[PDB]
Design a protein around this ligand. Structure first.
Ligand code: HEC
Length: 71
């Protein structure tokens, strides 16, 4: 999976093109604040104002792993 491309396709509408926030909060340093598993849970299931189901399976996992390293 190409995680950066999945993020550009599905996450920037709310998180901003450079992930520094737009309508929703920044996620450009999410790995500094969340573990990979916490990030995966949020992607699959949503959290607070974020809907669940935007990414699934291996795609979600690849995105979680990629963001987990951004600090
Ligand atoms: C890909 C499509 C996405 C990824 C990866 C993430 N999001 Fe979201 N998101 C949205 C809101 C309104 C929030 C705040 C909810 C809260 O944390 O109380 C979030 C939150 C996150 C978080 C956690 C907090 C942080 O800023 O790191 C992460 C790691 C995250 N999101 C990753 C809204 C939306 C949204 C609007 C409809 C979309 C398309 C996405 N989020 C998509 C992604």
């Amino acid at each position: 999976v190409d995680a950066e491309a999945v993020v550009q396709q599905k996450c920037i509408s709310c998180h901003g093109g450079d992930l520094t926030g737009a309508s929703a909060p920044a996620i450009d340093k999410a790995g500094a604040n969340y573990s990979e598993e916490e990030i995966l849970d949020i992607i699959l299931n949503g959290q607070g104002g974020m809907p669940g189901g935007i990414a699934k399976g291996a795609e979600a996992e690849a995105v979680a792993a990629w963001l987990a390293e951004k600090k």
